[PDB]
């Protein structure tokens, strides 16, 4: 976990979790709220917040379609996922500017 483990990408199981923007994980692998860095390549690292779900098969994280695409995650693909720790004294977002557009025309 701390050093990171190879894992297979999975599809998000439920709509609510997909709307939560949380990387759905297996309870036996991670715990809800944990932050993990997904290494898709030496230069491609992404940070996700982990949320547990009973249907998550061991050894995989369920990613919603937006998450996968943004991070280029392919279902059934292998990625290296390692625990990532935030520096809250410096990484607590005070002001975030978010672009909003209708998701569907």
């Amino acid at each position: 976990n701390m050093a990171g483990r190879s894992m297979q990408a999975a599809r998000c199981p439920t709509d609510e979790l997909s709307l939560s923007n949380c990387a759905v994980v297996s309870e036996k692998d991670y715990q809800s709220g944990q932050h993990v860095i997904v290494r898709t390549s030496p230069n491609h690292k992404y940070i996700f917040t982990l949320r547990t779900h009973p249907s998550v098969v061991p050894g995989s994280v369920a990613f919603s379609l937006p998450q996968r695409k943004w991070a280029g995650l392919s279902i059934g693909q292998e990625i290296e996922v390692a625990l990532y720790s935030f520096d809250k004294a410096k990484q607590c977002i005070g002001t975030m500017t978010i672009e909003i557009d209708f998701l569907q025309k």
Binding site: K69, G72, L73, S74, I75, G76, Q77
Partner: protein
Amino acid sequence: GMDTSGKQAEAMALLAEAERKVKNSQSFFSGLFGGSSKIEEACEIYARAANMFKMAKNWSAAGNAFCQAAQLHLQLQSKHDAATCFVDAGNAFKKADPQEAINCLMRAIEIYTDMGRFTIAAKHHISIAEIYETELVDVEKAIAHYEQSADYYKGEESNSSANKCLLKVAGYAAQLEQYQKAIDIYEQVGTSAMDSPLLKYSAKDYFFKAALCHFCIDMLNAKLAVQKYEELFPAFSDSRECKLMKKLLEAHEEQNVDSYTESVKEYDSISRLDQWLTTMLLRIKKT
């Protein structure tokens, strides 16, 4: 011959005087111990009796006589003759009852592997795989036989035969929905074919098939895979396969059935499709 059954009855009698010969082995060879050649001619009469059984179209009797001759002759000597007799029995058993053909072919396979003959062994492996396919329904055993035969072929750099066997295996696996093996094979064979000029005209088809298999599992990665194929081969996009794949994947972003239905109908209007592609498309495009 339709009227050669009187001498096939006489040939049952010939196998019977072979029986008299084994009776000699029982009692008379004590004084004829040097008559090993006599046993050989007994096997010879066995064989020719079996041969005219074959001429009389009595497949079961011909195969039984072949197996008996093989068993008698394989007295720890002349193993090649025993293997030939066993494969002849298997060929005779191919029609009518082929199950015992399987075991006799397995024995011949073992004999050849011990001897060191590999092309014949792999050919018999393909033979048993195809008889499984056409007569029985087991496919996994056929898959294993094809894998083993391809391994034997590739051991001696027999690249083309192993490539075709692996292509058939990949097709079966795709039919058996094990897509990782299918994509690995379709793309290993495509990249190998593109290497030499003599086959550079075929890689496109393999690439297209591999793309479909890839598009079967992960839609989001299908675009990346097709881009990788296009950049790998500059002349892949120009082929109609890449354009049609791009049309399908870009239309699949929005839920309009008419678009891909008319695309596939238009493509079919230029040439008929096969069962594999049509079935794969029907299964996949449902969702």
